Amino acid sequence: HMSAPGPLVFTALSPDSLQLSWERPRRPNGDIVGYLVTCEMAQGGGPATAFRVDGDSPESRLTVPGLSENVPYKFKVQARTTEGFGPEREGIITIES
């Protein structure tokens, strides 16, 4: 999926927050203007948080708070282009300590 963001890289910062990073799509389908990051418990049924990332970068980083430990979170990152959204890159992360 070359139009999708690179694989998500999770850097857990604390019991309740992590940094998510991703490389821009190797082959964007359109002009990337930002990203959409959506976070929710992987098990579903939970609240989702959407983060609108403004702009593009070879690698983008986002700190995502309001998490918890021992709960897998599913992150979905899509490039925002001038024409729409690119395909999602998904990544699941659990923070333990």
Numbering used by the authors: 1570 to 1666
Published text:
The structure of the FnIII-4 domain (1572–1666) was refined against data extending to 1.50 Å resolution; the FnIII-4 crystals contain a single protein molecule in the asymmetric unit. In contrast to Y1494 and Y1526 in FnIII-3, Y1642 in FnIII-4 sits in a wider pocket surrounded by uncharged residues. Therefore, phosphorylation of Y1642 is less likely to destabilize FnIII-4 and correlates with a minor role of Y1642 in the recruitment of Shc.
Integrin α6β4 is a major component of hemidesmosomes that mediate the stable anchorage of epithelial cells to the underlying basement membrane. The crystal structures of the individual FnIII-3 and FnIII-4 domains were solved and the relative arrangement of the FnIII domains was elucidated by combining DEER with site-directed spin labelling.
